[PDB]
Amino acid sequence: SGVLLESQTKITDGALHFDGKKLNHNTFENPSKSQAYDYFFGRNISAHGDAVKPYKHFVFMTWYKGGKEERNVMLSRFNTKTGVVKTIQFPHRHTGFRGDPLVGESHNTIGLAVSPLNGTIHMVYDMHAYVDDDETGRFKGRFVDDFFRYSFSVAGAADVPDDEFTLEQFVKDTSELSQGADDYKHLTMTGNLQDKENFSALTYPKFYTSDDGELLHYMNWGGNNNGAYYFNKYDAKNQKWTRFTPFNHKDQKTHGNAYNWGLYGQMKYINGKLRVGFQQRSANNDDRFKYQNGVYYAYSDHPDGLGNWKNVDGEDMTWPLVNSDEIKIFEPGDYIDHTAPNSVHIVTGFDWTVTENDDVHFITHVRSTDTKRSDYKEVSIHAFKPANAVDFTITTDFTGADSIYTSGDSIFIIGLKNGYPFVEKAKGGSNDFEVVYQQASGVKFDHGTIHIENGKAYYYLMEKGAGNALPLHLQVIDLGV
Numbered sequence: 001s002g003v004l005l006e007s008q009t010k011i012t013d014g015a016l017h018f019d020g021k022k023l024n025h026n027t028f029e030n031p032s033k034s035q036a037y038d039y040f041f042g043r044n045i046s047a048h049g050d051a052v053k054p055y056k057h058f059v060f061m062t063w064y065k066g067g068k069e070e071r072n073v074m075l076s077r078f079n080t081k082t083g084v085v086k087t088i089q090f091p092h093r094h095t096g097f098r099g100d101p102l103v104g105e106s107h108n109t110i111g112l113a114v115s116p117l118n119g120t121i122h123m124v125y126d127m128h129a130y131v132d133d134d135e136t137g138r139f140k141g142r143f144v145d146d147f148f149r150y151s152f153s154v155a156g157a158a159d160v161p162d163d164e165f166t167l168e169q170f171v172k173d174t175s176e177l178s179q180g181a182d183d184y185k186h187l188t189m190t191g192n193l194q195d196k197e198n199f200s201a202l203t204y205p206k207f208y209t210s211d212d213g214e215l216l217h218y219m220n221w222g223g224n225n226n227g228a229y230y231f232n233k234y235d236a237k238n239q240k241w242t243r244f245t246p247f248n249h250k251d252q253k254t255h256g257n258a259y260n261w262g263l264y265g266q267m268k269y270i271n272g273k274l275r276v277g278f279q280q281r282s283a284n285n286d287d288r289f290k291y292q293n294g295v296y297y298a299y300s301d302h303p304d305g306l307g308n309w310k311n312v313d314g315e316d317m318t319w320p321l322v323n324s325d326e327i328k329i330f331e332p333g334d335y336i337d338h339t340a341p342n343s344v345h346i347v348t349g350f351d352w353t354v355t356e357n358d359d360v361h362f363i364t365h366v367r368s369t370d371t372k373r374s375d376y377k378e379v380s381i382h383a384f385k386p387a388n389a390v391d392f393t394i395t396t397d398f399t400g401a402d403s404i405y406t407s408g409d410s411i412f413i414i415g416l417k418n419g420y421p422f423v424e425k426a427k428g429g430s431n432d433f434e435v436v437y438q439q440a441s442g443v444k445f446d447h448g449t450i451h452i453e454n455g456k457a458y459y460y461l462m463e464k465g466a467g468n469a470l471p472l473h474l475q476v477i478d479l480g481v
């Protein structure tokens, strides 16, 4: 109902993809030197992460040049008015798991943003908790002076004519740490190498634009059962970013908490507020949760997120946060009957959103850790608090999904089914999902990533096929809102 495909546009025939085998701790040191592209985590690296952004009549897309032998960082600008796709090839090539390019590293997406204030392009890429270390360190010195990888353009590059959309619009690293004339990777976003430690050991670049046109950016520090979210802001006036400031303290047990915890979720700018929603991973390994537990949520009344944080009830939040209890909504673990240590498994299936009408929505998924037990239990959960309601409605009458999106008066589930995009739609503040759209002909897709804007879903997709160089398409789906 109202949902329709506006355009499908091919971006390239050969974007990088890991067609090889799934290495592991024992074997990651013997990666196949043949044509196939082995990998350590997942196969996806193109059309993956924060890799698609609409700017005016353009859409910018980021990707890794295909061919296990190529792997170059790529940026393409698509002119939805003329149909032209102009692409810049950067010198940096995917460096793989812990710095060995023969092992595909699906964490190492290419995040993307374009400033509406000054038309600068911003790219953070190919990162997974890298630091300065030496030969005896886990990274064998492969990221010295290059553990945070930022590229960015002079002002106005976004709107430049097709002929001028070239690498020369981007700023070289000419600092004392520069690695040569093809060095386009900056170690910090502040333009001050003194901040470099502030940009160390980070993963997952993600950009948002404030309601006032300000670029926001956050990344993950750490992981497993000890992590933190860090965020900063783009100062267009001066063409540099602020330093990262934390949402929560790392090493919570040293900051007054009973235990360390990692975060599995996202910060999002929604309704003009920086917000966060996540499930934690406590370092406690004797309680009932093998991995994650809980659903947590908070928002900041400060335009930049520097303080004035509150939980869903408007209660002030200790900031930076130490104890996740302050912002706990509910416990998904309560929906499965097990209590023995590590018996409750929560990993996949979590996301959240807040509608323009201030409906708050969480989805998650809980199952028995032991898949073989006779009393195996598995549920998907949808927890939502309608705008003016007092308490959350929490139901297992829900099929499960990996993401939830919102636009206008609605929430959406969007993904691939048998290789073809579908859209499910429900009113904000309800559990009333219905399939309202399902592509049913054409080349099928392996995977993709979605960006919501303009009442449209921009579905940046990779086409199914063999090998490690596959085509990419952009679909612009009107959501009918």
Ligand SMILES: C[C@@H]1O[C@@H](O)[C@H](O)[C@H](OS(=O)(=O)O)[C@H]1O[C@@H]1O[C@H](C(=O)O)[C@@H](O[C@@H]2O[C@@H](C)[C@H](O[C@@H]3OC(C(=O)O)=C[C@H](O)[C@H]3O)[C@@H](OS(=O)(=O)O)[C@H]2O)[C@H](O)[C@H]1O
Binding pocket: 041, 042, 222, 223, 224, 291, 347
């Ligand atoms: C991130 C940490 O990095 C260093 O600090 C350190 O290497 C540490 O590793 S450790 O040396 O083994 O202790 C790392 O800790 C891992 O962080 C991962 C992360 O991405 O944050 C965690 O992986 C996540 O959780 C896994 C359970 C999940 O694994 C999938 O699902 C399961 C399962 O549910 O039981 C089993 C399979 O192995 C796998 O499908 C991870 O998925 S992934 O596709 O493998 O990436 C991931 O979401 C990890 O658990 C931490 O040890």
Ligand SMILES: [Ca+2]
Binding pocket: 145, 146, 173, 177, 178, 179, 183, 184, 185, 186, 187
């Ligand atoms: Ca550099």
Ligand SMILES: [Ca+2]
Binding pocket: 282, 283, 284, 285, 286, 287, 288, 289, 290, 291
């Ligand atoms: Ca535990």
